[model samples]
Target: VQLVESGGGLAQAGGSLQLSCAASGSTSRVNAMGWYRQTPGKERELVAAIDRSGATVYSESVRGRFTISKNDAKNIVWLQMNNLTTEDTAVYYCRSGVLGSWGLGTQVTVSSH
Candidate 1:
């Protein structure tokens, strides 16, 4: 399986941003994807794991301002964020399965100015 992540760019504090992941299935059994983030000097944090039916399990800190959705037929998953801050800057990664093929991380930056 392969995962391709896209949709990251500049955003202002208190604004919103959307990210997407396109998952290519290597097997019929593949049905989920994991979203994660890595800050400059911090360990990777698991943001969410979404299933085909759009069911998502999100980390506590990400629960309020983030929304996750998936489209099984299109093999796409989306992440929407609200009220972003400079602290939200990071490299976001998406992968197939829990520990499957990962895409090159998308770098997102949030500015306060």
Candidate 2:
């Protein structure tokens, strides 16, 4: 499967951003898809996960501000994070399938300027 992500840029603190991932080929093989984030100098962390059945789980620290979903029929997954702050700035990736597929990472930066 091919996974592509929308390139990220900048956002204001306390605002929100919508990020997306699209898959092509063997989308049905996706048993799970999830979002991960990596700060500039930190290891990647799981933000949230969703299955084809629409069941979702979010990391404890991110539960209140992050929403994850998948559109199985359209072969797409998206993430929305609200109430964002500078601490939210990071590179986000969409991990697809139990078989190890990943979308290109998107670098998100939150600025107060």
Best model number under TM-score = 1
Tens digit of lDDT per residue, candidate 2, span 49-76? 8887899999987788989877767777
Each prediction's RMSD to truth: 1.7, 1.8
Cα miss at 39, model 2 (Å)?
1.5
What TM-score would each prediction reach against the true structure?
Answer: 0.88, 0.87
lDDT of 1: 0.81
The segments of candidate 2 whose C-alpha lies over 4 angstroms from its true place after superposition are 99-101
Give the per-residue lDDT of model 1 (tens digit) for 3-101: 788899989998998999886657523567778999977998988887756678998877888888876677678888787878789999987665855
In TM-score terms, candidate 1 sits at 0.88
